[PDB]
């Protein structure tokens, strides 16, 4: 009996087509569909893409696949019933590469409301290309889109529609390594004009803001204090070179070194980094210290002038940690703030 | 005739559905599953996932597979048969992406009781991502899980139960390269409630003891004996500067590049990692042996002072490895006990 | 009675086939398609290729689909049909791999003018290898091309043309790291003649400006700066070799770090890069200030000589600014202009 | 006629399944296969695995399929025939992936005796993950293994049985970067319990040794010299403390960095590596002999004392090379020997 | 009436089979094959293999294929109907993996003369791995090859027999990276015995010289170079110490991580490749100069041995460039001559 209905509802008898859309010549069937994260992961500047896989429910009307037979309001179908019916098409248009999840089970549910209203709900792994501005790379927030098209019929046969309620959900413990998500999600239309004809599309927006602790421990710290290494060179012996020489070519290496050490994690960029101007300020003021040491050994390799040295000495450690201080003060406030 | 036998069980004849769920309209069948493990393998912190392959032994009832035709207890079908009959469709929750292994023949296990009881059993790759906490990275224990939901059905519907004896099992000789599984293994149930419904899921606990032999022989002993070096710098000549300043630049240098060395293979993260204290304090110790040159030359190069140099070189001798000795006791206890 | 419309217009009734060519034994078909491209991505001068993924929208027209029976200009059938009827057959020359994108529906377009025109729309992803010369490798503006032919047919069976009008378009807001993509689109013809015979065959072509920021700031800059830190040992004190001899042989060895790190990026090339001839020059110019202050030094060793190396001191630090300068000058001409 | 044969002697006409298995409810099927294998690629200590291709000869027998119509003893089927016919079902236990080659046509060979005698010959990629004991890394020979399972029948329905005569074979010009394979080859049986039942296994032993020079001209050959480079310093200028302390210093980072780069390639293991000793105390040595600088002078800065430094550096001198040499020689007694 | 035609020819009707051979119980069928390749990509040293895609023409004759029915000479059915006939089955021996391009429609061609000869065009991606003889790696020439092999029949069954002309074609424009093909090209016949049988094999040879250009660049100038900064020492102040030992150390190590800088490209291999004696020289020359230094000091600090020295220097001077000279002279004989 169950089987016989299974088959009197789709399938070749009563004549049901899965190629003919629902409500065939009239007002565009809509598909209301949202979607529930698993996770992200592998968000990488390099490829400068990221990757998240889904769960998207997708609902919409159909005529023909409603029933009278039983009582229940919505029925299960098989997961296999699934590629019997019609189904709204629709790709992710910046993909760059997706697939289903066919481990055991294919995982599909399909289940049709004694209406006739139809959830279609399918387990997808994306792959998401987003462009994302660096222009200040350590204290940035990322903005993050998906956008949902359908290729297959134009504006007037089809449309999409978010959930007016809980249209984009989180999984209830999703973290980010480097990354938090914000609470606040917006979510926006969009219309594609191709030449073929006009798609309706709909797109979500994730708000990332990354963490700042790696890159404070990692990148700032030892800056901060080899900077501060280069300021005891100015107290040391007026009369020997090579200690603060070494102090001052050491460190100036090894902030080069520390320099060169972030280039090799962030795709290739034209436009300044943010962490760029610190580490050119830092080796500025590192080189400017050796720069110190060199032109006080011009004035005195030259009675009096030694005396002026002796002066520029204490003017100087007096002025780097004012003028490293003004700078770090008039830094902070563009990125960390406002 | 076991043709005709085989043929008059499933398929066609007999009316009998792969569609529709065992003892449709009734009380939800229960899948008492088994996993056992053939290996772990390619546990990165980096990609933050490990990948896992199993036997998964799952079995359930259903009545209209039942016989009484043959005498044997249990009948192994062909694993092509497999298809034929209802399946109960789980996916791992976590899973990004999975797959089934088609070598030869397909890996499939199929064995219907005489009762009609179903053991079927299938062999299966799995790439896990698994939060991790390394707050403290070289020393930690780390709990891995799976869990198992029926994306097909609903609670009422459809239920995992572990089996009451042996549900996970290991490979006879399993090992794994940094880490120790431990033979106390937790399993734990839970309910995932969705927009959908609820739907059930069972997961395991794995508790990994990472090997602290690797880290030890080679993040640690380079450390400890850097400081060692750093310690005869104070026994050194008083008059000489080059020797003790050479040591204390490379070593701190060196302290720095071994430093660098351990940040690559971590994932990037927020929070201090264990290590990194042990970086810091002993990068400290060897900064503060140069400080410690620097400022006896600071008051020499200022007879009686020289004399001062001569007692806090001696009292720094003598603080030193009980700084480094008391710091050392005061490190170990929060990592390797408790 | 739609069931019956598509019933009667293709496959089995009507005597349709997909194994012939539209206008059999007739002037070769004509296949007029262009491209919508979405993005370029990950172009790796390593790997030599680049992947694009385009919309391929190719027409031609094919009597035996022709209907008088509704009224609307365009039907689209199901992306499903798009099997029946008989498609052109197009490979990419230079693929290298390629692949549908088959996640959720296929993505496929397929509308049939009531004229009999057929308008067909598939979403693929390529990589495609280009060989780029990179004689100048900084500057250099690169032609990246693809070219679609017919492996099925021979030229008088198929004919592929691009469209009159729009036959290459670009996603609105397309940007590529590293590259800037000219307005200016380059559209030409190909016959391939092969063994078999002649196949028809047509390409596209692209101008892609590498962007100068990322190398100038990275590449150029530093070695701008260490030969002006170069420049201020001729002023040092005559007297002193240490500090000149440290300054200069530690701009020659980072220079030469420097230079060895721009080799791995790029792919291992017979002919000189332009890169290679500005490092050459920088560490020419580098190496020539140690070799400068060596002689010095090999003229004092040796009370007149030592007059003269004061005046070589002074000619010197004149020479290099003027010397520098001139080969800037020269350089820039070449790569940044004409 | 041919045809009329090939369908005669299997498929639906004679009731021929393909689903039950040869000789139902008897003595269980015998497979005796042979593997022929083609190469090993990637042998990576790294991901722990190799891969290995190979042709797979399995022979059974089976009653239903004898024919004697032909006078040829053995017969091809096509290679699509060989979906037909039952085939005995095993997967590689420890795989970790796996796939036919499917290029051109399927890579098959089915040939039916016409005693019944059945020859099926498969060509299968394999990666394999063999857990290797590197307790003496550089010297070692390891031993590595497959074992082929059944894990569709229990022991009583089918076994595998190499094959008496020939039952692995190489291809005749086989050979392994940094390994060499060894002509004697091991052969054993194996049962597997599972909660299942007991599956039958057979497992091959490869033995392979390493090939020693390229570690011995990379690793070893720069430690010896080095080494050799550390004895000098004891010959030279009892007065002039900065070339031995250059030699010395940087002979120490030098072997530092010589360590650290062996580390890279192997996988991260708790138990000590056979080079890592060689580093120690290689490592022990050049900083043996930088205490030993050190300590003389603190010996001539404290003028008999200076006498007695005089008769330590004749005495050192002499014990270094015979120092390490007795280590040398003690050394290569427990890799190279034994 | 075509649809019939391709009906009547091949299919069910007139009992034509795809799984019996062309000529069955005759003699061995011959398949007339010539390559064309498109491109070599990847060639890595490392993986030990290169990538090729080519499209496979291959020509059999069968005489039930043939027609009377058109006038024309040769009719291309559609690629769908090329599963249809029966087909020659080979693969490559060496493949480690290949496949087929899908894009769009199969890659597939497919001609049947009236004759009753077949032409068959696929279109297919290789890796392969070629064993390489790196005893000369720089100036190497490697010959790379592929070898056909039928695994479906023996011998007396089926026979492979390149084009009497043109049997392989390149691309007209085809370069490769570091690499230059020649023009001159072997074809040569192989047959495999095998425990089953002996199956027919025909191999291409490829002979490609490496690009000496890179190498050159890259690896060899600046050894000379640093020889060239070695030789200097010498003509430098025979009084001062620090200057020559700097400019010989640093030059020493920047020797050794020259060295160790070509490592890293080519696998892991026993035997000892030839820049490696290069590089074993240029670090001689350059630790015997170190070694000339601290002699010359150890016969000084011991004032007519101090004119000895002086004598030394004058000799060492003359020998080195000699001594380099002869080397070098002896050295580009071996390998870029004969």
């Known amino acids: 009996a169950p089987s016989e209905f299974l088959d009197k509802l789709m399938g070749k008898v009563s004549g049901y087509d899965a190629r003919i859309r629902p409500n065939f010549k009239g007002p565009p069937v809509n598909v209301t569909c949202n979607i529930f994260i698993n ?21 919409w009307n159909d005529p023909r696949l409603a029933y009278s037979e039983y009582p229940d309001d919505s029925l299960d179908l098989d997961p296999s019933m699934l590629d019997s019916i019609w189904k709204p098409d629709l790709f992710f248009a910046n993909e760059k590469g997706a697939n289903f999840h066919e481990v055991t089970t294919d995982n599909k549910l399909l289940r049709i409301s004694k209406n006739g209203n139809v959830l279609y709900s399918i387990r997808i792994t994306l792959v998401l290309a987003c462009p994302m501005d660096l222009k200040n790379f350590p204290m940035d927030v990322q903005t993050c889109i998906m956008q949902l098209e359908s290729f297959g019929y134009t504006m007037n046969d089809l449309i999409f529609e978010w959930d007016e309620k809980g249209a984009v959900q989180v999984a209830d413990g999703l973290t980010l390594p480097q990354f938090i998500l914000k609470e606040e999600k917006d979510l926006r239309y969009c219309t594609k004009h191709y030449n073929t004809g006009k798609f309706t599309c709909i797109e979500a927006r994730f708000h990332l803001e990354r963490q700042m602790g790696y890159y404070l421990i990692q990148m700032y710290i030892p800056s901060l204090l080899i900077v501060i290494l280069s300021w005891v060179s100015f107290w040391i012996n007026m009369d020997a070179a090579p200690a603060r020489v070494g102090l001052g070519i050491t460190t100036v290496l090894t902030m080069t070194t520390q320099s060169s050490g972030s280039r090799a994690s962030l795709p290739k960029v034209s436009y300044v980094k943010a962490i760029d101007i610190w580490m050119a300020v830092c080796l500025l003021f590192v080189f400017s210290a050796l720069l110190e040491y060199a032109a006080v050994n011009f004035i005195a390799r030259a ?19 004012l003028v490293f201080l003004i700078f770090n003060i008039f830094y902070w406030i563009t990125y960390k703030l406002v």
């Open 39 to 59: 996770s992200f992961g592998s968000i990488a500047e390099t490829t400068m893409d990221y990757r998240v896989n889904i769960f998207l429910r997708q609902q």
């Open 303 to 321: 009675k009096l002038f030694i005396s002026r040295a002796k002066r520029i000495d204490t003017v100087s450690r007096v002025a780097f940690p």
